[PDB]
Swiss-Prot record:
Transmembrane segments: none annotated. Coiled coil: none annotated. The chain holds residues 101 to 435 of 673 of the full protein. It comes from the Archaea. It comes from Methanocaldococcus jannaschii (strain ATCC 43067 / DSM 2661 / JAL-1 / JCM 10045 / NBRC 100440) (Methanococcus jannaschii). This is Endonuclease Mja Tfb.
Length: 182
């Protein structure tokens, strides 16, 4: 999911609710864990008693268990800015619904161009997903032109991951973007 540090997530920790920067939570978890393993640049900690808002297999937005968290160093992220000054910061390997040749299709963020028309969900929060759930969530959609595409530095120098079983998505950040792993 390689999410930037600053993206707020809504969580339950050891049984209670709070709203926090995803990077802040995950840093605290890892730095307190004795269950860290590595996959190259990837630092992975398994965790207990943490739940995040996600869209589950029964088609509902609910608190769902996080099994593990992880982080890895990243050099660059793309900031996409659309009409109304909505914006999102994501790594290169993400794709977003774009109008291309008369259809809505997922396009990698590094292949996007100013003037491209993105399809955003009509909601306050972004969704980071590993599977297709647009049209499967009960949402209205809005069409917004890209204004800027900037290359920026990650807030921490790291990007972050949650593992959410039986959902493989989670809610994080604001705007109404749906970001697909790619
Ligand atoms: N570190
Ligand atoms: N889960
Ligand atoms: N990537
Ligand atoms: N196009
Ligand atoms: N088009
Ligand atoms: N493209």
């Amino acid at each position: 999911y390689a999410v930037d540090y600053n993206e707020p997530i809504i969580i339950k920790e050891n049984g209670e609710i709070k709203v926090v920067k995803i990077g802040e939570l995950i840093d605290k978890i890892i730095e307190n864990s004795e269950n860290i393993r590595r996959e190259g640049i990837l630092e992975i900690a398994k965790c207990k008693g943490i739940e995040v808002i996600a869209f589950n297999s029964n088609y509902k937005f609910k608190f769902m268990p996080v099994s593990e968290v992880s982080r890895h160093p990243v050099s660059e992220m793309f900031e996409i800015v659309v009409e109304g000054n909505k914006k999102v910061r994501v790594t290169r390997s993400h794709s977003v619904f774009t109008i291309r040749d008369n259809e809505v299709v997922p396009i990698r963020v590094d292949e996007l161009k100013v003037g491209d028309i993105l399809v955003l969900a009509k909601r306050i929060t972004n969704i980071y997903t590993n599977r297709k759930l647009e049209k499967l969530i009960n949402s209205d959609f809005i069409f917004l032109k890209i204004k800027e595409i900037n290359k920026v530095e990650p807030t921490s120098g790291y990007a972050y991951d949650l593992t959410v079983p039986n959902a493989e998505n989670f809610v994080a950040g604001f705007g109404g973007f749906v970001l697909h792993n790619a």
